[PDB]
Coordinates of C-alpha atoms in Angstrom, one line a residue:
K1 CA -13.9 -12.9 3.9
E2 CA -11.6 -9.9 4.5
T3 CA -12.0 -7.0 6.3
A4 CA -10.7 -3.6 5.2
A5 CA -7.9 -3.7 7.5
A6 CA -7.2 -7.3 6.4
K7 CA -7.3 -6.4 2.5
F8 CA -4.8 -3.3 3.4
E9 CA -2.6 -5.7 4.9
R10 CA -2.6 -8.2 2.4
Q11 CA -2.0 -5.8 -0.5
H12 CA 0.4 -3.4 1.3
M13 CA 2.7 -5.0 4.0
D14 CA 5.6 -6.6 3.5
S15 CA 7.7 -6.4 6.8
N16 CA 11.2 -9.1 -10.4
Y17 CA 9.7 -8.5 -6.7
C18 CA 6.7 -6.6 -8.1
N19 CA 5.5 -9.3 -10.5
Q20 CA 6.1 -11.9 -8.0
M21 CA 4.7 -10.0 -5.1
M22 CA 1.8 -8.8 -6.9
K23 CA 0.8 -12.2 -7.8
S24 CA 1.6 -13.9 -4.6
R25 CA -0.7 -11.5 -2.7
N26 CA -3.5 -11.9 -5.0
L27 CA -3.5 -8.8 -6.9
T28 CA -2.6 -9.9 -10.2
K29 CA -4.0 -13.3 -10.4
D30 CA -7.4 -12.3 -12.1
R31 CA -6.5 -8.5 -13.5
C32 CA -3.5 -6.4 -13.8
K33 CA -3.9 -3.5 -10.9
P34 CA -2.0 -0.4 -12.4
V35 CA -0.1 0.8 -9.0
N36 CA 0.3 -0.8 -5.8
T37 CA 2.9 0.1 -2.8
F38 CA 4.5 -2.5 -0.5
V39 CA 5.8 -1.2 3.0
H40 CA 9.0 -3.1 4.5
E41 CA 8.4 -1.9 8.1
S42 CA 6.8 -4.1 10.9
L43 CA 2.8 -4.1 10.9
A44 CA 2.9 -2.6 14.4
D45 CA 5.0 0.4 13.2
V46 CA 2.6 1.2 10.4
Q47 CA -0.6 0.8 12.4
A48 CA 1.4 3.5 14.8
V49 CA 0.7 6.0 12.2
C50 CA -3.0 6.1 12.5
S51 CA -2.2 8.5 15.7
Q52 CA 0.5 10.4 14.2
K53 CA 0.2 13.8 11.8
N54 CA -3.5 14.1 10.9
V55 CA -3.9 15.3 7.4
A56 CA -6.6 15.9 4.7
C57 CA -6.7 12.8 2.3
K58 CA -6.5 13.5 -1.3
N59 CA -10.4 13.4 -1.5
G60 CA -10.8 15.9 1.2
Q61 CA -11.7 13.7 4.2
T62 CA -9.7 14.1 7.2
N63 CA -8.9 10.7 8.5
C64 CA -5.8 10.4 6.9
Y65 CA -2.4 10.5 8.7
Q66 CA 1.1 11.1 7.6
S67 CA 4.1 9.2 9.3
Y68 CA 6.7 11.4 11.2
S69 CA 9.4 9.4 9.5
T70 CA 10.3 7.9 6.1
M71 CA 9.5 4.2 5.8
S72 CA 11.1 1.8 3.4
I73 CA 8.8 1.1 0.4
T74 CA 8.6 -0.3 -3.0
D75 CA 6.5 1.1 -5.7
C76 CA 4.9 -1.2 -8.2
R77 CA 4.1 0.6 -11.5
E78 CA 2.5 -1.5 -14.5
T79 CA 4.5 -0.8 -17.7
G80 CA 2.8 0.7 -20.8
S81 CA 2.9 -2.5 -22.6
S82 CA 1.3 -4.6 -19.9
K83 CA -1.9 -6.5 -20.7
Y84 CA -3.5 -9.4 -18.8
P85 CA -2.8 -12.2 -18.5
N86 CA 1.0 -10.8 -19.0
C87 CA 1.1 -8.2 -16.3
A88 CA 4.6 -6.5 -16.1
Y89 CA 5.9 -4.0 -13.4
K90 CA 8.4 -1.5 -13.1
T91 CA 9.8 -1.8 -9.6
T92 CA 10.9 1.4 -7.6
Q93 CA 12.2 1.3 -4.0
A94 CA 12.2 4.3 -1.9
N95 CA 12.3 5.6 1.7
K96 CA 9.0 7.8 2.0
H97 CA 6.6 9.2 4.3
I98 CA 3.4 7.4 3.9
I99 CA -0.2 8.7 4.4
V100 CA -2.9 6.3 5.4
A101 CA -6.5 6.6 6.0
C102 CA -7.6 4.9 9.3
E103 CA -11.0 3.8 10.7
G104 CA -12.4 1.2 13.1
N105 CA -11.6 0.4 16.9
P106 CA -8.9 -0.2 17.1
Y107 CA -8.1 2.6 14.6
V108 CA -6.1 1.0 11.7
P109 CA -5.2 1.6 8.2
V110 CA -7.7 0.7 5.7
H111 CA -6.4 2.5 2.7
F112 CA -2.7 3.6 1.2
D113 CA -3.2 7.4 0.2
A114 CA 0.2 8.3 -0.6
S115 CA 3.9 8.6 0.0
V116 CA 5.7 11.8 0.1

């Protein structure tokens, strides 16, 4: 069973698209997840953000880090009409800075806090 770091990778890493990938990565096989972001950068370059700019997370904890550069991301957002089993997503591609919460040793991303 998955570690938090493994779950982050299955849910967000990817070095219509959103309906296909959300199903493939087991996000919408048994529920419709409202939002999810996929990052199209190498895993090592996303893991490298845990030593970049320290910032407060949305919740006030301080183990969040913002990437110095923008990264290629796809945002998947459920339509207003979506209902399990027929989940449906609006796909938006963008190049944005990512903010991840990091934990562990090695200190690696375990939550996607935001893109900016």
